[PDB]
Coordinates of C-alpha atoms in Angstrom, one line a residue:
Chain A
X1 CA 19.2 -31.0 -23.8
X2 CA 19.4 -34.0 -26.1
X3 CA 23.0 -34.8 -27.3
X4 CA 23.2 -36.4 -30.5
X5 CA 26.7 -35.9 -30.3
X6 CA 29.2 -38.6 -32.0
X7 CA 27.2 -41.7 -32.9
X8 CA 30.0 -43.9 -32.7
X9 CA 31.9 -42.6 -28.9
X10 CA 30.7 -43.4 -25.5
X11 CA 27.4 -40.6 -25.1
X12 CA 28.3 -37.8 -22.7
X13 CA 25.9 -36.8 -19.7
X14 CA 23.2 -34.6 -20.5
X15 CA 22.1 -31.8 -18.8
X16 CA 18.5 -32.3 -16.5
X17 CA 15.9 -30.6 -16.9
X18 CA 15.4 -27.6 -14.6
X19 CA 12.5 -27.4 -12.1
X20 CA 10.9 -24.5 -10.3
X21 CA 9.2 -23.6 -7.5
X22 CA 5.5 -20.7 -7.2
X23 CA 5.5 -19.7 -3.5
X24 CA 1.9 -18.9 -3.3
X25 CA 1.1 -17.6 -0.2
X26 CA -2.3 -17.4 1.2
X27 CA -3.8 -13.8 3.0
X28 CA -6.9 -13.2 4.8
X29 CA -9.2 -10.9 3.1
X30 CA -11.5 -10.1 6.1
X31 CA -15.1 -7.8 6.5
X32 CA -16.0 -6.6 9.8
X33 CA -18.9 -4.9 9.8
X34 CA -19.9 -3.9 13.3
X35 CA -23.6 -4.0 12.7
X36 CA -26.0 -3.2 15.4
X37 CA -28.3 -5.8 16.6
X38 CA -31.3 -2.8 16.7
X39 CA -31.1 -2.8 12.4
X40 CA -31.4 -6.5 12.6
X41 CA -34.3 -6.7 14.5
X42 CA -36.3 -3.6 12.9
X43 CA -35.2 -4.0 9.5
X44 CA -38.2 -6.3 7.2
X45 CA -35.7 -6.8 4.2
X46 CA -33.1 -9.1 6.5
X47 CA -30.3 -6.7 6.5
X48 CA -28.0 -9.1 7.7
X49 CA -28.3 -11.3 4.1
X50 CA -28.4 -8.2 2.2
X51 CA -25.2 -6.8 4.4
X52 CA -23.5 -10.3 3.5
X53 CA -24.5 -10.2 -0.3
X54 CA -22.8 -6.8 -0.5
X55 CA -19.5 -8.3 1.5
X56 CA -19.3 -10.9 -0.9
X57 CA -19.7 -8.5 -3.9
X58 CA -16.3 -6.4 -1.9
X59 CA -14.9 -10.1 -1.9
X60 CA -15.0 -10.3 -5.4
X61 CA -13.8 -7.0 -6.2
X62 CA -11.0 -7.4 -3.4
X63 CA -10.3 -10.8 -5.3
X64 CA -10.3 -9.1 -8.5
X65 CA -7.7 -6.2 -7.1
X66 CA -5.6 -8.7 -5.3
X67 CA -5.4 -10.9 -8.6
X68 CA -4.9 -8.5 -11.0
X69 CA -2.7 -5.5 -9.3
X70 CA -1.7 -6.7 -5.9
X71 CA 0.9 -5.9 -4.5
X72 CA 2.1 -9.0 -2.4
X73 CA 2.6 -7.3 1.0
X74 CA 0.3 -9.8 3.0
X75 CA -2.0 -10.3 -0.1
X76 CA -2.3 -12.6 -3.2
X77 CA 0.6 -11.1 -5.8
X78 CA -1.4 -10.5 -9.1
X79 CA 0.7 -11.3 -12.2
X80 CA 0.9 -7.5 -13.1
X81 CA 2.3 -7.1 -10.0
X82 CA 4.9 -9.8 -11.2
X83 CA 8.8 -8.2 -12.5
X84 CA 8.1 -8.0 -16.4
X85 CA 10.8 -7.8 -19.2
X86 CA 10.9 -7.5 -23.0
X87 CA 13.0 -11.1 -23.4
X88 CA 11.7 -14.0 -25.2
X89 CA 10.6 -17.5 -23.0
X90 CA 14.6 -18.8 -23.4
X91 CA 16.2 -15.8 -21.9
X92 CA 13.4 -14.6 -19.6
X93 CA 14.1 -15.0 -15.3
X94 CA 11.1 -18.0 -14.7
X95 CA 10.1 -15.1 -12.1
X96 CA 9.4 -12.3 -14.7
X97 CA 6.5 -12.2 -17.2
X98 CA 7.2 -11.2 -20.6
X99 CA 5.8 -7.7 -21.4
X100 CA 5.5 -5.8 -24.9
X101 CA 6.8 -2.3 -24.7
X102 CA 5.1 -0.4 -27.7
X103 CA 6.2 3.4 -28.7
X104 CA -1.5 1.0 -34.0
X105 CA -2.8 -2.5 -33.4
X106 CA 0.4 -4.2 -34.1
X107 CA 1.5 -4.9 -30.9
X108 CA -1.3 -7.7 -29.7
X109 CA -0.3 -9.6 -32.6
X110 CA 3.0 -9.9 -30.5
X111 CA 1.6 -10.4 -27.5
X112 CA -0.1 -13.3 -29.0
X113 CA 2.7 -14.9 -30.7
X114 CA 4.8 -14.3 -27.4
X115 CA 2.7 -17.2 -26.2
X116 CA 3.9 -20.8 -27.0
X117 CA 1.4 -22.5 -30.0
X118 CA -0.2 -24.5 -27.0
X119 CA -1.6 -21.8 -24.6
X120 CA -2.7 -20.4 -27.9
X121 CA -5.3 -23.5 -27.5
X122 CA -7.0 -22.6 -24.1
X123 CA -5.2 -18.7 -24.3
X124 CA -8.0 -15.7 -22.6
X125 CA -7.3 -11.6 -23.0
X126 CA -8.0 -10.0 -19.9
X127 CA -8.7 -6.2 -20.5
X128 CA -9.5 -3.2 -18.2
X129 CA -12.9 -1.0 -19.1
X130 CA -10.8 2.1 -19.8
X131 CA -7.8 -0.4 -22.3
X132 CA -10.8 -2.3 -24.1
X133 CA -12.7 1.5 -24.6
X134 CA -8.8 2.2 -26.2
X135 CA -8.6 -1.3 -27.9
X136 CA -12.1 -0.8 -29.4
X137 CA -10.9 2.9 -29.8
X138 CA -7.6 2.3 -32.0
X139 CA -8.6 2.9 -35.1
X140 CA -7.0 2.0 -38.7
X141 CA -5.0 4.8 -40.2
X142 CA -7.8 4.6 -42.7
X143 CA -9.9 5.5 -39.4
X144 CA -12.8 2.8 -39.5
X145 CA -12.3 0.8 -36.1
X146 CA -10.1 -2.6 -36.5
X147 CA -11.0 -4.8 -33.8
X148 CA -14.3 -4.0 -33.5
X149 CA -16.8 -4.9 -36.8
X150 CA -18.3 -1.4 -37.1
X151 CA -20.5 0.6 -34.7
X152 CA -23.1 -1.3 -35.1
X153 CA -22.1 -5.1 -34.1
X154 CA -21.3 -4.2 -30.7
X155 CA -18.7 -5.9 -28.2
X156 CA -16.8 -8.4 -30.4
X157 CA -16.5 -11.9 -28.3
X158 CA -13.3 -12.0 -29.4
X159 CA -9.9 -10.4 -29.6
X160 CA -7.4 -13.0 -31.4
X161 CA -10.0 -15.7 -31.7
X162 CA -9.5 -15.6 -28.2
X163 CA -12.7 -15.1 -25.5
X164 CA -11.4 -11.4 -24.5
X165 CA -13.0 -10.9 -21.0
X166 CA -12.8 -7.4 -18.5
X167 CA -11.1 -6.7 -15.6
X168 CA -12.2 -3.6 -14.0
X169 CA -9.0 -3.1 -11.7
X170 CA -6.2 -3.8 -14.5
X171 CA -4.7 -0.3 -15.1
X172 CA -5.6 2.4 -17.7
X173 CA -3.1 1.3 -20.0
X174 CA -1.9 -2.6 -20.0
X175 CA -3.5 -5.2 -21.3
X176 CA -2.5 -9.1 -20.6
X177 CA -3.8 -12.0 -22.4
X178 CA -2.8 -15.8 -21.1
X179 CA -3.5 -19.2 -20.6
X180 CA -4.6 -18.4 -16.9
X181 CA -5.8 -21.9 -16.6
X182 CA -1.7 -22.5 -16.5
X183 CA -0.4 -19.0 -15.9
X184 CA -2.1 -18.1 -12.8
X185 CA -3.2 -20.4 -9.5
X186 CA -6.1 -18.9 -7.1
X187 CA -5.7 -20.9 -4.2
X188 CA -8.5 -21.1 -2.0
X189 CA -8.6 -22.7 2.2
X190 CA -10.6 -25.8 1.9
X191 CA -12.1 -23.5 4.9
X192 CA -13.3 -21.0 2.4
X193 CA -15.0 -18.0 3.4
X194 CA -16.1 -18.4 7.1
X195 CA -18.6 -16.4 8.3
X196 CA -19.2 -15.7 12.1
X197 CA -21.5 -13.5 13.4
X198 CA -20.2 -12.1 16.3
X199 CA -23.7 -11.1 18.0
X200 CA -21.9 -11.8 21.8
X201 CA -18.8 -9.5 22.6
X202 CA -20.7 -6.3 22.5
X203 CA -23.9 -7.2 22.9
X204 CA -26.6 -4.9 21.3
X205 CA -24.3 -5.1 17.9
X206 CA -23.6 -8.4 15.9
X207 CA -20.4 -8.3 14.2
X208 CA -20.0 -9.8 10.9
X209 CA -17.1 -11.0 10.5
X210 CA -16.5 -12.8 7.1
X211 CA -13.3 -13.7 5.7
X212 CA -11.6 -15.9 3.1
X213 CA -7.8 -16.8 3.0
X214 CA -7.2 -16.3 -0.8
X215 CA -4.1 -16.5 -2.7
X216 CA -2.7 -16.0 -6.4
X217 CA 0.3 -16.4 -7.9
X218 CA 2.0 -16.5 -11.8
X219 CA 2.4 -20.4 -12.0
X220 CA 3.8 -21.2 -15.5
X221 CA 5.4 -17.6 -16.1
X222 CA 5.4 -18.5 -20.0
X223 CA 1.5 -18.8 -20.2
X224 CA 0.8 -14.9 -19.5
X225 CA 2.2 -12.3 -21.3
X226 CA 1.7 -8.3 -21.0
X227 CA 1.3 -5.3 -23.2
X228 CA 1.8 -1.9 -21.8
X229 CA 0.4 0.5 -24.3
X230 CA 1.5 4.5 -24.4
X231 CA 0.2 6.5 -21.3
X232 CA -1.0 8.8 -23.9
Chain B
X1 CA 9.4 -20.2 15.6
X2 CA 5.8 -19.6 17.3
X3 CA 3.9 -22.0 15.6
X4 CA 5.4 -21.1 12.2
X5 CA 7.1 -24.1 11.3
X6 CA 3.8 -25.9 12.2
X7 CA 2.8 -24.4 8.2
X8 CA 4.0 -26.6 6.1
X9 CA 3.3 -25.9 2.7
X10 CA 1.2 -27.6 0.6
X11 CA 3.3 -29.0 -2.6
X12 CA 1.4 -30.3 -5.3
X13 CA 2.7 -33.7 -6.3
X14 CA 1.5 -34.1 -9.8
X15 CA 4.5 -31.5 -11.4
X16 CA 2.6 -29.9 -14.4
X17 CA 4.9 -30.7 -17.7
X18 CA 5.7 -27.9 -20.4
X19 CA 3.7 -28.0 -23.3
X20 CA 5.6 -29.0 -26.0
X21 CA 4.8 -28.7 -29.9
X22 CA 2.6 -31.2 -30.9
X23 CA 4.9 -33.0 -32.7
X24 CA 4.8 -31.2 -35.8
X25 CA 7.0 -32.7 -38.1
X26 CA 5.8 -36.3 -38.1
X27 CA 2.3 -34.9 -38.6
X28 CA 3.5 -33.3 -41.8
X29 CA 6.2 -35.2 -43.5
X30 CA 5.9 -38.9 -44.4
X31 CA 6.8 -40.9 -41.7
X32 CA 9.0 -44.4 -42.3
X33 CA 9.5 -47.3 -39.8
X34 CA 12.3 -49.6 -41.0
X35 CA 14.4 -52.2 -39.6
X36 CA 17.4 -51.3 -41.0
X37 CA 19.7 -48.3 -40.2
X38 CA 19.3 -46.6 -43.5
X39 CA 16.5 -45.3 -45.9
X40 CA 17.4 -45.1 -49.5
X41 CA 14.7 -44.0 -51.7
X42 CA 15.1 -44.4 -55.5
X43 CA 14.6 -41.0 -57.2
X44 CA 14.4 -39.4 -60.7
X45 CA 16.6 -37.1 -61.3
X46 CA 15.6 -36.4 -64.8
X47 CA 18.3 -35.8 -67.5
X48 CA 16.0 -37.6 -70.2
Chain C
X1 CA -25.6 -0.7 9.8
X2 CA -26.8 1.9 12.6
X3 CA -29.7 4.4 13.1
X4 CA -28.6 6.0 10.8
X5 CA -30.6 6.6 7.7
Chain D
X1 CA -24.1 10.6 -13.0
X2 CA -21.0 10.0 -15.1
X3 CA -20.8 12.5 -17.7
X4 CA -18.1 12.1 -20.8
X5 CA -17.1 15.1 -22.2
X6 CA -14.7 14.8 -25.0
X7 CA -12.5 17.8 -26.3
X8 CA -14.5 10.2 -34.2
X9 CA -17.4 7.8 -32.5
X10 CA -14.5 7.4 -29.5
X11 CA -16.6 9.2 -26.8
X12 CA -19.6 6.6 -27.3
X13 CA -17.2 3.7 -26.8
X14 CA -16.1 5.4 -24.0
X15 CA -19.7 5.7 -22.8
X16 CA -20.4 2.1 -23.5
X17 CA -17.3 1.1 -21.3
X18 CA -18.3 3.7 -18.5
X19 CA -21.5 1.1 -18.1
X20 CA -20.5 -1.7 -15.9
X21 CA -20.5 -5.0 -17.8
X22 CA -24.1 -5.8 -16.0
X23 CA -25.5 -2.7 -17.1
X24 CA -24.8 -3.2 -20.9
X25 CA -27.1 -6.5 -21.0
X26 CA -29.9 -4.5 -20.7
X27 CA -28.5 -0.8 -21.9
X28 CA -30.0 1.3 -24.1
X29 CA -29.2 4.3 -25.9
X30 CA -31.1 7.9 -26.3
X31 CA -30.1 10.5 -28.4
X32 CA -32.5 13.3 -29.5
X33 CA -33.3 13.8 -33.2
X34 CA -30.2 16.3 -33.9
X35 CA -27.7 14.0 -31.6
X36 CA -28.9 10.7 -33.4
X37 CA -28.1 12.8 -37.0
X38 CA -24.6 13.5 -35.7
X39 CA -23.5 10.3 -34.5
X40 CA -25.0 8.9 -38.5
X41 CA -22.5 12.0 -39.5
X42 CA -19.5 10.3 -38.0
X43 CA -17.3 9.3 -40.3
X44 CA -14.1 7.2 -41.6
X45 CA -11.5 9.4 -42.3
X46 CA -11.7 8.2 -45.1
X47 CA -15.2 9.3 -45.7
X48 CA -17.7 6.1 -44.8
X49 CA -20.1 6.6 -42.3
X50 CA -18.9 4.3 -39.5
X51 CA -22.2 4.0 -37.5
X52 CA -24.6 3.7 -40.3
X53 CA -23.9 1.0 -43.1
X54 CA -24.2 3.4 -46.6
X55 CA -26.8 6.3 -47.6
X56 CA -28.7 3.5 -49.6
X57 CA -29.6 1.4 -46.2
X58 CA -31.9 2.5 -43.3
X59 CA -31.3 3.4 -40.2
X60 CA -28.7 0.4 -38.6
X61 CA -30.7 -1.6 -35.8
X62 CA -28.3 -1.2 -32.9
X63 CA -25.3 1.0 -31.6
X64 CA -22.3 -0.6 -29.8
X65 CA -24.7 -3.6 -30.2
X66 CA -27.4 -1.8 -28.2
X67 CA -30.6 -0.4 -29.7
X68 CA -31.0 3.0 -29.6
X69 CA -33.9 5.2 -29.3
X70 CA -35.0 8.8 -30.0
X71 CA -35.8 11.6 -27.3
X72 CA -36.0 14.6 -29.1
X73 CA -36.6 16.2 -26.0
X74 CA -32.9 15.9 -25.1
X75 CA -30.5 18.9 -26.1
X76 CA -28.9 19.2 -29.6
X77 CA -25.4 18.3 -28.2
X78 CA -26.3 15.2 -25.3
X79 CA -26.4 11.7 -25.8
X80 CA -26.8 9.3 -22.7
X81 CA -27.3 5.4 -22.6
X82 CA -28.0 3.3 -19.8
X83 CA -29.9 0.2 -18.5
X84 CA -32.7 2.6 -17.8
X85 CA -35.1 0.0 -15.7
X86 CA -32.1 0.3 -13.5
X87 CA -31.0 3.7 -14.5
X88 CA -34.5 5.6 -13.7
X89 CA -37.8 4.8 -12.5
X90 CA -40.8 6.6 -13.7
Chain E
X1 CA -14.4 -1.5 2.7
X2 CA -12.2 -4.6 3.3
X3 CA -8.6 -4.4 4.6
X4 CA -5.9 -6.0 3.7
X5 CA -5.4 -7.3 7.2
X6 CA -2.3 -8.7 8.7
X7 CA -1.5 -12.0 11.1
X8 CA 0.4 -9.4 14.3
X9 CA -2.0 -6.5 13.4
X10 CA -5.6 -6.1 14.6
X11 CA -8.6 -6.3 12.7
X12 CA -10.0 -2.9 12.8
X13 CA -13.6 -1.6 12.0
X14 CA -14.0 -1.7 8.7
X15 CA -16.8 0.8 7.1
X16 CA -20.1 -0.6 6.3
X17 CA -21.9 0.1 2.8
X18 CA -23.8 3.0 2.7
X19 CA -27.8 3.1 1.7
X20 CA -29.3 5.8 -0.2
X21 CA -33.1 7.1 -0.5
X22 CA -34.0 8.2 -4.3
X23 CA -37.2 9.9 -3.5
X24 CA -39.2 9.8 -6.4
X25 CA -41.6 12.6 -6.0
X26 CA -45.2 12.1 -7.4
X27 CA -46.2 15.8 -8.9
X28 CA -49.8 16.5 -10.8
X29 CA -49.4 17.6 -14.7
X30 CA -52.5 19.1 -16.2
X31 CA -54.0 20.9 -18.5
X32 CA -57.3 22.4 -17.6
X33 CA -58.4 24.0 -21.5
X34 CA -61.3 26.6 -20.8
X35 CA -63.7 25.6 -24.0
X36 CA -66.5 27.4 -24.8
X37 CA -69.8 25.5 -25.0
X38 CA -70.7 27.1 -28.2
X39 CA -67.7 25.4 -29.5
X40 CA -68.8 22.0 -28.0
X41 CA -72.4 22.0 -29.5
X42 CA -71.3 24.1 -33.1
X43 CA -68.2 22.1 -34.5
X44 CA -68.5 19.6 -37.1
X45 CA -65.9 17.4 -35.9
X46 CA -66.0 16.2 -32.2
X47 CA -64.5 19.1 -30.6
X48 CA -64.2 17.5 -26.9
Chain F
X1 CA 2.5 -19.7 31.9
X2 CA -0.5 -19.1 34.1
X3 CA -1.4 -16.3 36.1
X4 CA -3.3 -18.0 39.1
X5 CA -6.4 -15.4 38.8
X6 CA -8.5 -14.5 41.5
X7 CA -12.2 -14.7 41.7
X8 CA -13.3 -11.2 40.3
X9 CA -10.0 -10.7 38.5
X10 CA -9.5 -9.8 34.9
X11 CA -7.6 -12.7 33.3
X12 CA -4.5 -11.4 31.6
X13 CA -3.2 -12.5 28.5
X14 CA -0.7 -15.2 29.1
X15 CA 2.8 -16.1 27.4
X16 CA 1.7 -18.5 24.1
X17 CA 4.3 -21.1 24.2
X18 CA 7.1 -21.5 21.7
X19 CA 8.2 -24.6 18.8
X20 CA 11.8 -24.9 17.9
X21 CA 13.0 -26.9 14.2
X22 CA 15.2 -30.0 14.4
X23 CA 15.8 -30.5 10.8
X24 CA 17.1 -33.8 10.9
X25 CA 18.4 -34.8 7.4
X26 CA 18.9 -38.2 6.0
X27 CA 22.0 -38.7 4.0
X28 CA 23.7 -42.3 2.1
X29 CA 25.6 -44.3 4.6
X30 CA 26.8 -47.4 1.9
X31 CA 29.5 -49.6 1.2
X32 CA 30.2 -51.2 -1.9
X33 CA 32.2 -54.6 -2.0
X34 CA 32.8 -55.9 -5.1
X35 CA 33.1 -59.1 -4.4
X36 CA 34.4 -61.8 -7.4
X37 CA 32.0 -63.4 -8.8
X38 CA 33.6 -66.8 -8.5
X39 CA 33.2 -66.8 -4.8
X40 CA 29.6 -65.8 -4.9
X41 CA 29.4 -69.2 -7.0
X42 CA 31.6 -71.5 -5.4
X43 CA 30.7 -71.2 -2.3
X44 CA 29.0 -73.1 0.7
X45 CA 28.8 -70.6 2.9
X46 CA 26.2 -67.9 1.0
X47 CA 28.4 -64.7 0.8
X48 CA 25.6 -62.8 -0.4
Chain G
X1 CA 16.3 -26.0 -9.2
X2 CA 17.6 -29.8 -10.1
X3 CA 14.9 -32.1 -8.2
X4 CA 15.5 -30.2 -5.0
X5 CA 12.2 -28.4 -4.8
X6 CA 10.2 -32.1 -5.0
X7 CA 12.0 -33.2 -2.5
X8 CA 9.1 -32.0 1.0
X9 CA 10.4 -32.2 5.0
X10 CA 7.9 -34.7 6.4
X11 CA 7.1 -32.5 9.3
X12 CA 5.8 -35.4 12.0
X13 CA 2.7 -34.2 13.0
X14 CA 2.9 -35.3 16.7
X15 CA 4.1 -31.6 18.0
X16 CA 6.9 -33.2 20.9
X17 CA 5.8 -31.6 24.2
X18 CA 9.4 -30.8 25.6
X19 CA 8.0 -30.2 29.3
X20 CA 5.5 -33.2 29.8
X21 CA 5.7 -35.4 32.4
X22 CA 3.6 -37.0 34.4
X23 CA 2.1 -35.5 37.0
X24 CA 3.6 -37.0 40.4
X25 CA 2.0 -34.5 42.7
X26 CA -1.5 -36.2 41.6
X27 CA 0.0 -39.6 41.6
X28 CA 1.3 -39.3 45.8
X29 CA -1.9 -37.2 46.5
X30 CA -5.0 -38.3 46.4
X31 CA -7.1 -36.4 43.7
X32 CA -11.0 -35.4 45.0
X33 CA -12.7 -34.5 41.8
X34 CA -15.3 -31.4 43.6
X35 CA -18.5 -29.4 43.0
X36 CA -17.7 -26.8 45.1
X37 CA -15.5 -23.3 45.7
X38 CA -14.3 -24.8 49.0
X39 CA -13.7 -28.4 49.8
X40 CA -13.8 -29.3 53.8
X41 CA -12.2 -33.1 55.0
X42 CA -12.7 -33.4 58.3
X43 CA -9.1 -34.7 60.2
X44 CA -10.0 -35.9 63.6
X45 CA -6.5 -35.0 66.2
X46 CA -7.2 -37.3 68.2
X47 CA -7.4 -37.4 72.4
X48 CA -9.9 -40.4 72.4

């Protein structure tokens, strides 16, 4: 706070800015294919890079799942996992995300206007399949789609002037948009993913084991905001 | 106590600031820089 | 990956 | 395959969105004569064709941004679209 | 599959991606029209 | 610990060894003279 | 909340080994670095 208090007095003690603290905890997610070594050998398509292609393909959908709706027992803690609540920035627990609570198209307009005018700047929607079908789906009461241009245009790049993009494991009915840039913080092991072929403890079969210690977290709890439509 | 408190955790030193709004005022209304500790400005009130 | 189609 | 069946264009968004985001680079529809007349049919509620621009303009080049083309050898009441170099091989 | 694994738990055998055969099966279409000569040699357009 | 294996023995798992926390803190041990300014000028002896 | 979360323990990254010392059995013995499962001196008894 900035007293201006009593120009002419002594100037009382001002209040310090608050600070707090994003435990982001790091968790291995891990592939162990037990592979035999006989595939290896007679396969002519190198199994083994097409077998780690498709574990990095699970690494990004794992990432995706873990970022968006995990949990946090031993894995990254994606901000929908977060506590939410219907208070403004000011009242909101630093912990909690703020979340619109619907019961139309209206509500995004919220959601958008929930952020502060500078995440606006840099601000990205991130939609499941099933909530942009729904999104491209709500309809005026006039019936003729409203985010959409028509039938014809196809996937509008944009929600709110904003780059919309998809998330296939958000759930069926909430939506998010943010400036993740601020409101979230992947953290990767300067490690990375470390893969080891373990083609020595049971010999005949080469192990692949692959894993990368990822983490996510809601840094900057007022740069991503949520909007739980109806269940329908 | 196994090796745990070996982890320290990595704390970012540069703290990130809150975005504040872009200073909206000064952009919009005329802006004065005097030496003195008022600003009187002459106006015409009409009545003519 | 076995012999297993 | 995945087959929507719906109990007013909202099933065909629902189809585009059953595509993975890959798929709908290169998706295209098909709809068979009768199908392709019925999504044109679709309407506002209000009472303008959604899909089509007016009566006086042709057919519209794409749908859900994709083009669309026309098996009439599919049934009066299917529509599928897909990323069909991927989808099926001949 | 990819587990969620822990630091005091085991890695256990995860299940490996599964490979499937589309067999596209080659079949012979024909059409094998019994035309009479005489309509080969007596119409006015090219028949054949 | 270590098990003294045998030639031809299995070698057991043995006891990882344990780390303990001394969180030493660091806290303001001061004093503050204030100490007239007269003697800090007439002086010969520096009582800085 | 109030500056205390900036504030990191500098964990000293030399782990202190409670139970090192040196060793004084190989200091009073004599230490014959070996190639070899058994080692044989030879320790004449004497009678000359």
């Amino acid at each position: 706070t900035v007293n201006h208090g009593e120009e002419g007095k002594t100037r009382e003690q001002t209040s310090t800015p608050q600070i707090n603290e994003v435990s982001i905890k790091l968790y291995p997610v891990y592939a162990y294919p037990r592979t035999t070594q006989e595939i290896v050998d007679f396969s002519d398509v190198d199994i083994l890079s097409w077998l780690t292609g498709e574990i990095g393909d699970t690494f990004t959908e794992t990432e995706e799942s873990d970022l968006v709706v995990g949990d946090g027992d031993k894995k990254a803690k994606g901000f929908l996992s977060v506590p939410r609540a219907e208070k403004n920035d000011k009242e909101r627990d630093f912990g909690t995300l703020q979340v619109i609570k619907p019961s139309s198209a209206d509500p995004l307009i919220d959601l958008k206007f929930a952020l502060r005018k500078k995440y606006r700047k840099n601000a990205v929607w991130v939609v499941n399949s099933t909530t942009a079908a729904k999104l491209q789906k709500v309809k005026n009461a006039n019936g003729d789609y409203i985010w959409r241009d028509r039938l014809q245009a196809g996937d509008p790049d944009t929600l709110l002037g904003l780059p919309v993009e998809y998330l296939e494991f958000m759930p069926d009915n909430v939506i998010a948009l943010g400036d993740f840039k601020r409101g979230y913080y992947i953290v990767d092991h300067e490690t990375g993913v470390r893969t080891r072929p373990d083609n020595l403890t049971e010999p005949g079969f080469i192990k692949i084991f692959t894993q990368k210690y990822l983490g996510g977290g809601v840094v900057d709890s007022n740069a991503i905001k949520i909007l739980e439509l109806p269940q329908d | 106590a196994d090796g745990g408190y070996t982890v320290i955790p990595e704390l970012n030193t540069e703290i990130m600031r809150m975005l504040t709004d872009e200073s909206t005022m000064r952009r919009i209304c005329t802006v004065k820089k005097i030496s003195s500790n008022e600003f009187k400005q002459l106006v015409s009130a009409g009545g003519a | 990956s076995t012999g297993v189609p």
